[PDB]
Design a protein around this ligand. Sequence first.
Ligand SMILES: Nc1ncnc2c1ncn2[C@@H]1O[C@H](COP(=O)(O)OP(=O)(O)OP(=O)(O)O)[C@@H](O)[C@H]1O
Length: 329
Amino acid sequence: HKDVKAIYEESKILDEATHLYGVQRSDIHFIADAENYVYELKKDGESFILKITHTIRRSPDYILGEMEWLHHLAKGGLSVAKPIASLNGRDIEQVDDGQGGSFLLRVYEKAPGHKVEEADWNDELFYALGQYTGRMHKLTKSYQLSDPRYKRQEWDEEKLRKYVPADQTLVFEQADRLMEKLAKLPKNQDTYGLVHADLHHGNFHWDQGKITTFDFDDIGYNWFMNDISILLYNVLWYPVIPYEDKAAFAGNFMKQFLKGYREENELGDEWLAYIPDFLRLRHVLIYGLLHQAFDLATIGDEEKAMLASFRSDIEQAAPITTFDFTKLS
Ligand SMILES: Nc1ncnc2c1ncn2[C@@H]1O[C@H](COP(=O)(O)OP(=O)(O)OP(=O)(O)O)[C@@H](O)[C@H]1O
């Protein structure tokens, strides 16, 4: 982001990171610069990830909410990429930028193992995901926010009039209609809570059967089942091995997943009926995301094809898959 780029002096800030985490520049290796500057850190045969944002993008209060939730999960025995306390004991280190803002550094453990590959993509993985997500939801039920200042967002706070062309009347009607239905869903301790909100196979590592999640940047309050539907949406979108039949792959994924999940959390079967609304809601979000990403002026025929496919799905309230999830009772 250009306002942040304008301020960042990588060598100056990374020297701070050296003073703050005890890892020399030699051992700090650039990885990405999208929503954070991301570096891998290596020391004593161990690996860590360092992320850096800024106050122009995120408040420390906000990120402290994430840190608090990770601590709770780790404390309860869930394998997560734990934040690493700086030499001053902090999970977030604020580095003054010299002009009234701060860079926000944080370091996490590098999750053991690798992103899943074709040999790992099978019913045992989908079962394991189910077990792991069930443990996660179970543990979030006992999470106690320490103060309202660190409070994360509600399900409907990250719809598309800001980013979509204002003449797409039918898009907004369907989306409005969808969000109004969803607002009426019951929220209680056994249906709704702080959840990861962005589970896919880019966001976890697999190490001889053991899952560890990372990228908790966007955690928020949401329904347990929507947390689950977001995983489903992503695995339907970019599976590691392509599937032949969408509905039957959706059905089997959720069968394997729910068998594992039922070992670890009790979520009422009435929730199954709302998997297709939640898949549709994620479709709406993506469509809004692609309008923010795309410059409609400089966009080719393929980008417009993508946009068109999404647009007619939304407009016609088309199911993302035809599988009937109520049969997995
Ligand atoms: N705690 C962590 N443990 C292990 N790997 C991590 C951790 N955090 C981030 N990564 C990995 O380091 C990089 C983080 O980069 P970033 O989140 O900016 O990119 P991404 O959008 O996830 O993926 P890509 O850049 O490949 O499209 C990714 O390759 C990510 O999978």
